[PDB]
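Ticket opened by: R.M.
Priority: normal
Category: complex prediction / small molecule

The reporter submitted a protein together with 2-amino-4-mercapto-butyric acid and asked that the result be attached to this ticket for the collaborator who will pick it up next week. Submitted input follows.
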Amino acid sequence: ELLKPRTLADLIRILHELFAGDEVNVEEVQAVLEAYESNPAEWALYAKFDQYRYTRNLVDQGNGKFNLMILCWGEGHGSSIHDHTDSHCFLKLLQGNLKETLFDWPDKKSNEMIKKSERTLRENQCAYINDSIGLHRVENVSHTEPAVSLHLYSPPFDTCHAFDQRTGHKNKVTMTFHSKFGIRTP
Ligand SMILES: N[C@@H](CCS)C(=O)O
Ligand SMILES: [Fe+3]
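Result attached by the on-call engineer:
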């Protein structure tokens, strides 16, 4: 019985219930993420920015079944074109806006990766991606407003691939946490 999360802590409790089993009801997870109304005071602890690139801040390690983290995007900060390592990936905006650009999986032939579409993800909206849908790039294109997003991945993963937009060639990247549970982890 999906109820509206009252707070971030409540959302986390609800997520532990939704991931109690072996499968994932994507539409339910997306719905409860969207229903949480971002309250900056509840997540300030995790919103640790870096001047030069976006940061990944672990919030909850789940139940063996999911990571939950907050990403902090300075003005002009963005990601590579990347995959999600056979995991579900939910992205909910907590503050600001992000541009999501979708790409198809490249062919073996070296070729420019042409965007398939783009959209603007706005505060409180929750997007979903997985490798069957495609690849994406996420960017804070704002010149004046930092963005903060809440990401849930299931199963957890700590590596993915970055794709060269000019060729489609991929390289494996290991993702690192800037902080965990509010503690900076250099
Ligand atoms: N998956 C990316 C962020 C955009 S979804 C990352 O984990 O760093
Ligand atoms: Fe992503």
